[PDB]
Write a protein that binds this ligand. Sequence first.
Ligand code: PLP
Ligand code: PLP
Ligand code: CL
Ligand code: CL
Ligand code: CL
Ligand code: CL
Ligand code: MG
Ligand code: MG
Ligand code: MG
Ligand code: MG
Lengths: 356, 360
Amino acid sequence: KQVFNFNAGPSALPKPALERAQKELLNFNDTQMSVMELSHRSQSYEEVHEQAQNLLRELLQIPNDYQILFLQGGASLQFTMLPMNLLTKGTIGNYVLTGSWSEKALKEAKLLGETHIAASTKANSYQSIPDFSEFQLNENDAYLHITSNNTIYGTQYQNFPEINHAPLIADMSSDILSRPLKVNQFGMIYAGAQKNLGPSGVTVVIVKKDLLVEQVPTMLQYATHIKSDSLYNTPPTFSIYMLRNVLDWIKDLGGAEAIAKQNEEKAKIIYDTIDESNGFYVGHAEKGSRSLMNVTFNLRNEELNQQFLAKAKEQGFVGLNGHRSVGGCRASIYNAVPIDACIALRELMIQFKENA
Amino acid sequence: VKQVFNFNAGPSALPKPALERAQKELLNFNDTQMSVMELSHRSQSYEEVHEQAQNLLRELLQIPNDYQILFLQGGASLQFTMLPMNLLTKGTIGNYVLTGSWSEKALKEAKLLGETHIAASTKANSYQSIPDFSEFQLNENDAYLHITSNNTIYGTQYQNFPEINHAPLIADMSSDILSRPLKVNQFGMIYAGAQKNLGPSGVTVVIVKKDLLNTKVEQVPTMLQYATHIKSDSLYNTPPTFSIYMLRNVLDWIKDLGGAEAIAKQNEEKAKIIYDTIDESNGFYVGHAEKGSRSLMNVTFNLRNEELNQQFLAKAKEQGFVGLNGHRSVGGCRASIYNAVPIDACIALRELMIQFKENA
Ligand SMILES: *Cc1c(COP(=O)(O)O)cnc(C)c1O
Ligand SMILES: *Cc1c(COP(=O)(O)O)cnc(C)c1O
Ligand SMILES: [Cl-]
Ligand SMILES: [Cl-]
Ligand SMILES: [Cl-]
Ligand SMILES: [Cl-]
Ligand SMILES: [Mg+2]
Ligand SMILES: [Mg+2]
Ligand SMILES: [Mg+2]
Ligand SMILES: [Mg+2]
């Protein structure tokens, strides 16, 4: 009954968080009701809601002048909500393209206003993060948007640019809270929970308050949610409960620095395996841009790729097929993927290479 | 432990077997050794759940084949703007029937986007009834006519639905969807946040006439187009998988009890227990709704003054009752008695109400 969950989104969750959820699923906090059966205006729910925010604040050390929002719609809705709120006439939504998710965000902005590409590694099929000295910025930028971890391509920002002419905005869906962050570098950060933080259904938005509106639908104004503490309408209460639970697990293991140590060890196991394979496995990313969250690689040809992924699946590994747009293989090693799973993957990779 | 009676208005009581089923397989769903929360929404295990939730709805409400069932995020509140964004085009009018606060919120969002009209309204008499369909002021350039089937805050409910042929009839059915049989082809679109009568928060059910809305609307953000979700079968981006799973489990329970027709029978009986208590109270309890409009889902009432209101609600809370306080905008009391609220909770409430009255 061996299963190794390398799913890319939704993804593995910490066993203690799921076990805690199971145990109190019918009787939350001695109320004799599921957390799912509580009113979102009840104090019982309100404490959970606030506890999830508090844990994020603590774990990412989010300053007081930032607010933490829990929204629905996924990171995908943020792609349009952001320009809807910030891309005012005579300003420009400026994008750094480091993968296909970058492209999807830029597409939504083009609907609503003037856009620009500050830099892009598309020509080289997104094998790296561009040098910050190469960015083309504009006086009238409304924001600079980046994708911190390029989920499909397996590359990741090592650090972030020092931007002062406009707010820096980041889609951190696939690496939020996988390492310490300097939140003050950003005007806004957003992430679907379903990779590193919890189950699908909630989006975390960390926003500089004073940063962010005539004619925008009520539900699509950040101001609505800031003003109502993300309780303007009914929030995804069970997803926020599970987010709380995952955050308690991260706190319990030592926080963002401790989880970074685990994550770096996980990625080290896979990349070392690839690098020591003498070209049998080939990583897509340039070394300097290698993601710690999604490891992308291929075998020497499509038929070996296929034989590998078939053997993987038979041995209990789940989610290793690369994104359809790029093929190959992708090992997603988000926070809750245990080191034992990556070790198992290594051992499978080594045996397959030997037996080919 | 002591008794708990769950009259919460949204999210609300779930049927125990749906929760017990979720609890038992929470760590290992369908023998995959993963939680349904840990699966890819492209996995066959998830797709099965997603398809079953749709098929159960189709069968239970008898939805026609030219309608599609969408599972969206954002709540009913997001539908308030998505609807006029897709259908309220230039030169057309969003026509609304106002029968409570939720109707006003819908209208307000359309006013942001286009020409609106009010076909009829009971706002003047504080939304104690559903207006007569004969009073509906209709326009030839209406993009749709929008109603609220159950007015959650005021406790009133449509007994039946108007025949509309000049425009699509649209209904917010958040608080009474699948509480009774429905003739879906009366409508162009029905929407409901799931958390009142269908399951957990986090997913919104939208039943849509495919040809009214499977076409691209120029200038509308991809996520805000119905077309997007119709084309991708609600898998355009990552769905709320656990919410949809729980929705499936709740729909299975409704089917297991005999479907919409059987649940309507149960719902009328529960409601009768409370309204008869009110009606035999000689004015000690006063229902907000006029009798012909009384909701079967949300029973709204007041005692003779605010002091007695507060003492009644304090006593209830002390006796284990949860969620009876009226909506903050109107005060008084509100017994929400959605599908999964058990009839012995209603009997318990009656008992409370009668001893409070006798002892006051
Ligand atoms: C998965 C992902 C998204 C899509 O998120 P949804 O919640 O499915 O909208 C957006 N950006 C990145 C970087 C992602 O990895
Ligand atoms: C609760 C309610 C809503 C709001 O739903 P959200 O999911 O909170 O947006 C809308 N309409 C009716 C009739 C409701 O009862
Ligand atoms: Cl990408
Ligand atoms: Cl992806
Ligand atoms: Cl109402
Ligand atoms: Cl309500
Ligand atoms: Mg702890
Ligand atoms: Mg080495
Ligand atoms: Mg059954
Ligand atoms: Mg009982």
